[PDB]
Amino acid sequence: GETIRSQNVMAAASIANIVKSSLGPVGLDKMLVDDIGDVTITNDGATILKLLEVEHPAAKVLCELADLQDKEVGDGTTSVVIIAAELLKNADELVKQKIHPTSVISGYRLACKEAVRYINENLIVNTDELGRDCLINAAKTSMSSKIIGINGDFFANMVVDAVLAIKYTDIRGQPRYPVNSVNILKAHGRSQMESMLISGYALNCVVGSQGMPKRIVNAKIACLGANVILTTGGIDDMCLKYFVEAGAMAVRRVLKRDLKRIAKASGATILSTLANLEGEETFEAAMLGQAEEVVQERICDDELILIKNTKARTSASIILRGANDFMCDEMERSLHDALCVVKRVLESKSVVPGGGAVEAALSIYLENYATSMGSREQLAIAEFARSLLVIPNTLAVNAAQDSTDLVAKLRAFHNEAQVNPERKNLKWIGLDLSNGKPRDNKQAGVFEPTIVKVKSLKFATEAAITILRIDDLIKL
Amino acid sequence: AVYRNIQACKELAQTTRTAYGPNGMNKMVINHLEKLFVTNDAATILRELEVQHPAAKMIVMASHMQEQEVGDGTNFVLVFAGALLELAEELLRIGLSVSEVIEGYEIACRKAHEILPNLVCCSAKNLRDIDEVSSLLRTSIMSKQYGNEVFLAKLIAQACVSIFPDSGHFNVDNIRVCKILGSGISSSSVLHGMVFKKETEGDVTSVKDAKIAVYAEELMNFSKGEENLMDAQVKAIADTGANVVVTGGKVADMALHYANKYNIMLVRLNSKWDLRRLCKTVGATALPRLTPPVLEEMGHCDSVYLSEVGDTQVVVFKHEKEDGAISTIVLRGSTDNLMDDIERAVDDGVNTFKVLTRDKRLVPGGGATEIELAKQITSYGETCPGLEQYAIKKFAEAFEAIPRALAENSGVKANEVISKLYAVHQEGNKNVGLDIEAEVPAVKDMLEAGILDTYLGKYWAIKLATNAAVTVLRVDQIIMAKP
């Protein structure tokens, strides 16, 4: 009914207002007062909906909306709920104008069909790997909101050098980049310019006895006449004295992740026990490494055993020397998170410029597509475009800017591109969330995957069809 | 019972806070005479909006003094005063007294009167030209009737230039405006002397007379006796020699024949206010009886004739032999409601230059000089020791509310405007005011645009506004009595 559907709209309208200001990097937080009394404050919108417990059947459709998006993609689930929330506000207005929900469903499915096509006609391929570099520029913008920006080209080049040396396919010619990355640590080398990049993983452990040398160029690395012995089970004092007699550099009580990273970096496999169920064997030339040089570097208060130039490493190690504890700690997370920006861009190879440019540019093509279909599908496809402009309109408030200006300057640049393909027209322009202005994402480096924007518009349109397909209310 | 007086004046400002500036909102004025009016003039709001709270009446009587000796700055009286008391509540929240705050404003009023001449950048050239008056009257057209900046700038200039040669004799009472139903503003014109839209009832063309006098058998016998009675009245007028007779009431069909018999020009004016204008120009008063032949109550005019301007027969009352200082601006408009709104913008322009008959000094507006004035008063407040710092510092922030009104009324954010107005003045870029634009929150130089206020107007506007905030704050409790 007209009043039953109005209650499903006002119900879902408030769910989006709860996670409206939580989306984006400068989003507002909210308190999560459970039934006991514990208050929890978070900024991410995905966990808000997980703990947002409100009894309404029309609201639970949006709870399962993000669960399916969390498993496949795992990001941007909050923006999926806002798109579907605003679509029903406009769809109910169609019903007020004597429009049946059936015609709105078929129009939304075609508006979603052409939305994927127009995205595919504005995609960008994996590039800037050889011959050209803005990946420097792509990572330089990732760290503009921190104090690290005083030295742009120095730290920016370490991001490109740390993401390229870790290349490995390992599955059917997939190549992505693993969850594990370079081990970033800190130091006190009296300055920030002494930060050096080494193309080899360093083990944060001590060499044991002082009489043995901290340098060895042996090929055999025994991972549990190999000199570099690694064992998490522990080695006895009388046992280490025999390695002094043998000339080996043993390390005991090593972490499994640090040993496995070395076994992956050295090409070895972790040996659990020596006894092969009947006797005793050291497993020679079965799980030993292949390396050229192994030396420990003098680090302040936490020495690192540096291994260099293995057979296949796909790893590195950077030392962040600095002046004070504040200067080094802040650049750790700015260096590891800014590296994750280009990591996914170089991996999931079909990407697209985001930053509000997708939903804004789609509002122009689908507007004209409505005037080409007809037959009780124009107002449905026409209003699908106005629902997508709320995402950049929402970020306009989170960025503390004029709500109406940023969305409009973004549309006028994309409109000139459709008039004619000349280079004078601005193409692929986003919005700078840190400053509140337009910004060319191709030069700034605001890229996003293809599976994010495509699946979000499908799940948001499919869920809104479910809430609008409901046309009855029975209570026992 | 002090804050209740502050909340009373605070509400009175918020009504005219939106009617300030060129992008100000209009007001749905419902007259007490069962009439509807729509305008954005702040002076007309208080005439109809009967504010019975006597605490706010002190601000209204100050605004009434802004009509005497000056014809501009009415929003300054209501906005600057209303913002002074809003911040005064912030002081009493801390625990300050009322006398120290009053004394701090009494000192700041003396500091503000000394900074204003320093910000006088340009002034009028004193050439009595039409381009000089029209170029400077753009400030009076602002916020009274937008869009007619081109039409009224020249129309108002034409009536004042005829009197400027009469040095020290320019007055608003010498410029009487008339309005006629028409297509629009394009059909407006300007004429000399007194021009009335009503045509001449008689067939007399021109006359140079100075005497203007403003005012079954038995059944057919008295009917013809009335024709002899009316003839005896025009004969009594012919005995006096008054060839120009202004009729206030209705005219008989036979009187039109006798008016042409003795060669007497007969003009009808049904509007009483138009008849009152003749009382103060030629000396002829309106007599109640049927044409008293009183030679003493007749006026003096060098020439009277009929004219046709804009396809409208209008009688001319000019003075050729005498010097002559009367001018009539005849506007045309289809809607009587909007046509009267233009009539008020004309009176606002005539009175703007009436003050410039004195020492000609002008100051740029648009948030340029108000922040420059608040920037210098804040400097005196920082170094001046004693408890007067809190009152003088907030007296500068009261000047900030005016450009904040120009920002919000223009749809522009109020905080972003003052942040940019203070940055340009920190570098010394004086005379930089807010640019009127719904999309551009930037600023520019107002002197280059041709926006210049009256230095003599801001003086009395800042004095009467601050003295009203003292008169309202001195009264801490209103107590009723029964005579």
């Binding site: 006028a412 008039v419 | 007001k27 007259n31 919000e408 749809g411």
Partner: protein, 511 residues
């Protein structure tokens, strides 16, 4: 009684919507009627937007703004007030959710004045002047437009014969066309084919007194007397009552009473009035005076027909017979009492100042003759405005769609706050072709959705067909409207909306 801010504007927005809803279904030729009752109980059934608002008399001030704006529409155009108030309120509805989003009301005025000036420039771009297109005579093309105005009406079958009288009725007038000079009279009986067109001034002629086979009707150069005096013997206004104390004087009291009518009719013979068109009735005795004196007379005529005769013959209506002279009498070439429809009728043909005409309507029912009067008057208007203004556009809601395409496509390339405001201004222009489908019973969803698809393909003159539930070229269908009308109407609409949006506070003087 005062209120300001955001919610005050909503009171004026939602108040103007009620005025539009009161005349929402009256737009178009097949629009629904409305019934208004005064204190006397008189019920008026009509679909005229100007008559509805003139009798509603809403005390709310915001509603009075649209009435004064529509009053000017009769001055600048002449009609079409329903399109003004409807389109004036549609601008206020689409901007309602944006007022609550934190936007200032004055920002919309900079957008409406931008779109209003942009639309007037586009009207002159697409407008086509049609004077001698394909060298078809103007009298032929105007009849093709007259049949379109009478299409889907009571005389749709024989509309080809009626069209000859629509254009010829205006051709007999001078260069300045005027509908007030055109009269329409209804005669009981006869078929739709038995209709006629009288270039002279004819009246109902309800004179049902005696005097048959007398008063010779044929005159060569008669003199039309327009009197307002009753010429009855025992007249209610002309009588005598004297009381004397002499038997022989009572005879004289009837003589002096007899002299009231006799002397008054004698001045009519002194002036030489052969035809007397009087407002009040004429008794049976006075009818014989004109018969014996070789004259004609006819009373019981409304005042509407006397003024049509006043400007037709060039005379002036006089009250009494004393001032009856040649300066107020008329003149014509042919005058004869006709028996059209079985009833007697008079008409003056060949006057020097014959700037008027009369249309005789025939039919077997009075309700059929009333609808044809407005259908015929509607066909004269299309023929009237087509002659005065040769530059016309695609009417029937076709031009409102092109304006919605131009202002929307232009607002897309306009950065700043004007995209959703001019965009909503373009979305509000689509309501006229949306409501004419509702006012005609058609499904506005299927028409408007399919109508906009043709303009994207390039349709500039495709619009709504009032007859068939489909889309057709309104320019080829002789559905024309002037350019100045759509120009002067759109500016008045934005003048009403911009004046309502500019107002923010409501003030009431207690008295």
């Amino acid at each position: 009684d005062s209120s300001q801010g955001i919610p005050q504007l909503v009171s004026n927005i939602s108040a103007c919507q009620v005025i539009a809803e009161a005349v929402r279904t009256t737009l178009g030729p097949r629009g629904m009627d409305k019934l208004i009752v005064d204190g006397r109980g008189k019920a008026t059934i009509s679909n005229d937007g100007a008559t509805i608002l003139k009798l509603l008399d809403v005390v709310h001030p915001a509603a009075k703004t649209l009435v004064d704006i529509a009053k000017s529409q009769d001055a600048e155009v002449g009609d079409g007030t329903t399109s003004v108030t409807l389109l004036a309120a549609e601008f206020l509805k689409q901007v309602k959710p944006y007022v609550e989003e934190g936007l200032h009301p004055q920002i919309i005025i900079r957008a409406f004045r931008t779109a209003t000036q942009l639309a007037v420039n586009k009207i002159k771009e697409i407008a086509v002047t049609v004077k001698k297109a394909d060298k078809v005579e103007q009298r032929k093309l105007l009849e093709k437009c007259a049949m379109t105005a009478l299409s889907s009406k009571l005389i749709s079958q024989q509309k080809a014969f009626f069209a000859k009288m629509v254009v010829d009725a205006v051709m007999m007038l001078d260069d300045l066309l005027q509908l007030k000079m055109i009269g329409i009279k209804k005669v009981q009986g006869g078929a739709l084919e038995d209709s006629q067109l009288v270039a002279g001034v004819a009246f109902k002629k309800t004179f049902s007194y005696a005097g048959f086979e007398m008063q010779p009707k044929k005159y060569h150069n008669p003199k039309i007397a327009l009197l307002n005096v009753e010429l009855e013997l025992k007249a209610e206004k002309d009588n005598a009552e004297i009381r004397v104390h002499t038997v022989e004087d009572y005879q004289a009291i009837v003589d002096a009473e007899w002299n009231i009518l006799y002397d008054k009719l004698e001045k009519i013979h002194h002036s030489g009035a052969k035809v007397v068109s009087s407002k009040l009735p004429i008794g049976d005795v006075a009818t014989q005076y004109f018969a014996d004196r070789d004259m004609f007379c006819a009373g019981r005529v409304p005042e509407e027909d006397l003024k049509r005769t006043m400007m037709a013959c060039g005379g002036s209506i006089q009250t009494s017979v004393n001032a009856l002279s040649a300066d107020v009498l008329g003149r014509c070439q042919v005058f004869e009492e006709t028996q059209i429809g079985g009833e007697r009728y008079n008409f003056f043909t060949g006057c020097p100042k014959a700037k008027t005409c009369t249309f005789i309507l025939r039919g077997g029912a009075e309700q059929f003759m009333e609808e044809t009067e407005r259908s015929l008057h509607d066909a004269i208007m299309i023929v009237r405005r087509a002659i005065k203004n040769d530059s016309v556009v695609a009417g029937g809601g076709a031009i409102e769609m092109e304006l919605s395409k131009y202002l929307r496509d232009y607002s897309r390339t306009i950065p700043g706050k004007q995209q959703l405001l001019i965009g909503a201004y373009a979305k509000a222009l689509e309501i006229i072709p949306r409501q004419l489908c509702d006012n005609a019973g058609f499904d506005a969803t299927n028409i408007l959705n399919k109508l906009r698809a043709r303009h994207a393909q390039g349709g500039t003159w495709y619009g709504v067909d009032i007859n068939n539930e489909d889309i057709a070229d309104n320019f080829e269908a002789f559905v024309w409207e002037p350019a100045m009308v759509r120009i002067n109407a759109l500016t008045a609409a934005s003048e009403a909306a911009c004046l309502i949006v500019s107002v923010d506070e409501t003030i009431k003087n207690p008295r």
